[PDB]
Amino acid sequence: PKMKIPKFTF
Amino acid sequence: PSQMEHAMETMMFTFHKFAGDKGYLTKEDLRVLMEKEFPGFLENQKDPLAVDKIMKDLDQCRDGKVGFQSFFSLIAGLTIACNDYFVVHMKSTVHEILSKLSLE
Amino acid sequence: PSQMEHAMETMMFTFHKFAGDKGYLTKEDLRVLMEKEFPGFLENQKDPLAVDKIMKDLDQCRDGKVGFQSFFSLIAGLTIACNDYFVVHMKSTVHEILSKLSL
Numbered sequence: 001p002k003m004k005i006p007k008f009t010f
Numbered sequence: 011p012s013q014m015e016h017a018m019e020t021m022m023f024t025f026h027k028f029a030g031d032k033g034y035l036t037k038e039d040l041r042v043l044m045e046k047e048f049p050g051f052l053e054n055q056k057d058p059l060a061v062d063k064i065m066k067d068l069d070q071c072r073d074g075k076v077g078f079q080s081f082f083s084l085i086a087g088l089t090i091a092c093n094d095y096f097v098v099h100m101k102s103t104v105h106e107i108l109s110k111l112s113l114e
Numbered sequence: 115p116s117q118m119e120h121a122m123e124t125m126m127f128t129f130h131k132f133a134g135d136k137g138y139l140t141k142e143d144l145r146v147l148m149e150k151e152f153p154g155f156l157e158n159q160k161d162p163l164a165v166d167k168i169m170k171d172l173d174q175c176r177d178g179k180v181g182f183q184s185f186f187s188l189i190a191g192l193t194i195a196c197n198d199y200f201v202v203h204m205k206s207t208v209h210e211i212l213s214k215l216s217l
Contacts, residue, residue, distance in 0.1 A: 001217055003171050003191030006083055008067065009183065010091040010113045014128055014152045015208040018193045020121045022208070025197070033201070047118045078197045086186050089122050093182045096130065097137065104119040104126065 021085060025078050034075035037065045040084075051088070051108035125189060129182050138179035141169045144188075155192070155212035 028043040029035055035043065041061040044052045052060055068084060069076050092107050132147040133139055139147065145165040148156045156164055172188060173180050196211050 001191040001195035001215075003168060003188050005174065005184070006086060006187050006190060007070075007080075008083060008087065010087040011206045011209060012152050012154065013124055014189065015154060015212065016206060017121045017124045017128070018152075018189065018196065018212075019206060019208045020117055021193055022197055022200070024118050024121070026200070048116050048122075050116070050119060079194055082190050082194060085118070085122065086190065089125055090183055090186060092122065093126055093129065096126070102115050102120060102123060104122045105116060108119065108122075 021082070025081055034077055035081065036074045036076070037062065040065050040068070040076065048105070048108065050105040051112075054109040055112060125186070129185055138181055139185065140178045140180070141166065144169050144172070144180065152209070152212065154209040155216075158213040159216060 024047060025035075026033070028039060028046065044061060044064075057063070064084070065076075066072070068080050070080070088108060091111060091113060092104060095107055095111060128151060129139075130137070132143060132150065148165060148168075161167070168188070169180075170176070172184050174184070192212060195215060196208060199211055199215060
């Protein structure tokens with residue numbers, strides 16, 4: 001896989 | 011057999027169960043979802059368009075479909091904000107913690 | 115009482131259980147974590163430094179600590195890639211699906 005930073009939270 | 015894996019499992023089977031062969035989610039899909047699994051939030055929320063605005067903040071493409079990726083993010087924004095609650099208002103349960111704090 | 119909420123619950127209690135009052139995770143924290151909860155992957159992996167390289171790809175700040183946010187991402191990269199498996203190699207269980215495909 002590729003654990004990359006997500007986009008947006010709350 | 012573990013916990014996280016037992017969780018990730020549900021998380022994985024909680025998407026298509028509300029999607030299907032289509033493999034995605036539309037505005038009406040999210041709405042019904044957040045009300046077919048975790049209503050303990052959107053319900054006692056502060057707006058009937060919450061799902062509408064949330065849906066918008068989700069599909070950054072605005073086509074109607076919502077992939078598992080962007081989807082997961084939703085399952086995150088809640089958990090993240092929820093986690094921050096432990097850092098203050100603390101230190102089945104989420105059913106309440108969710109309906110409690112909300113942020114635009 | 116629901117499913118997702120029952121899940122999100124675990125997810126939330128699976129972080130501090132491996133963190134503590136400190137409220138974060140160091141290289142040695144991740145390592146022990148991925149081996150104290152979901153070893154069904156890193157174990158039958160293709161490298162003993164997997165955790166080291168993964169840790170690096172996690173704390174984009176390189177200080178040692180790993181917050182719940184960046185942390186969750188990890189719980190995602192696995193689930194996401196795992197999900198893609200249904201789209202092909204298909205159509206407790208994750209315990210195997212995880213140890214199966216990797217980068």
